[PDB]
């Protein structure tokens, strides 16, 4: 489903964050920005989802910077 699983804004014409494990974990950039600023940063769903293994995935610093802009 192509909309944010937090704010439920459609993501059909823009960019978003896609959890590598859970397909239904889509997040708009504002929602991703709120999770980054609050976390410090794992999956904005809070389920600390893992990589494509079991170690939980986290935003790279360059991804964090892109979202904040």
């Amino acid at each position: 489903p192509l909309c944010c699983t937090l704010c439920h804004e459609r993501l059909e014409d823009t960019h978003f964050v896609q959890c590598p494990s859970v397909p239904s974990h889509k997040f708009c950039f504002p929602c991703s920005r709120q999770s980054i600023k609050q976390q410090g940063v794992y999956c904005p769903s809070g389920e600390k989802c893992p990589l494509v293994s079991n170690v939980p995935w986290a935003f790279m610093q360059g991804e964090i910077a892109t979202i904040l802009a």
Partner: peptide, 7 residues
């Protein structure tokens, strides 16, 4: 790993 930022 691929970016979580998608379009």
């Amino acid at each position: 790993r691929s970016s979580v930022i998608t379009s």
